[PDB]
Amino acid sequence: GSHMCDAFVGTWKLVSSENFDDYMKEVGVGFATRKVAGMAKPNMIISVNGDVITIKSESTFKNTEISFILGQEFDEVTADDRKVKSTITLDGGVLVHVQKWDGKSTTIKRKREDDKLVVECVMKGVTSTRVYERA
Numbered sequence: 322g323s324h325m326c327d328a329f330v331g332t333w334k335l336v337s338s339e340n341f342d343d344y345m346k347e348v349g350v351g352f353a354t355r356k357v358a359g360m361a362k363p364n365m366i367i368s369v370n371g372d373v374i375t376i377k378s379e380s381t382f383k384n385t386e387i388s389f390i391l392g393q394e395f396d397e398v399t400a401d402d403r404k405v406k407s408t409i410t411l412d413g414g415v416l417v418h419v420q421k422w423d424g425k426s427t428t429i430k431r432k433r434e435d436d437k438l439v440v441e442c443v444m445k446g447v448t449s450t451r452v453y454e455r456a
């Protein structure tokens with residue numbers, strides 16, 4: 322069936338993270354914003370309403386929300402307030418998310434492994450990995 326919904330929906334709390342500072346620095350985030358965001362350990366709520374997928378991130382620091390349809394490009398406003406154009410597709414069961422803006426691109430993969438949800442964000446060379454568990 323759509324096994325995609327079952328795989329992704331629910332509430333995910335961050336449990337580990339590597340290279341995030343470096344990833345943000347590369348994406349262009351200011352030093353103070355990088356630091357506070359580095360400590361924020363946000364939740365990622367994923368939901369599905371028919372064809373429309375929704376991903377929220379809530380911390381005390383900052384909240385964000387995207388709603389989208391796979392393959393359909395949409396305007397997104399990132400946590401650091403980049404005005405970007407996003408496209409999220411489903412590849413092998415992985416959610417691939419591309420952000421284009423000002424000639425730059427960054428790719429965010431979200432993939433289920435075991436009971437975990439692994440997010441890999443790649444900008445130019447720099448790769449960051451975050452791991453989430455169901456809350």
Ligand SMILES: [K+]
Nearest residue numbers: 361380381382
């Ligand atoms: K927090």
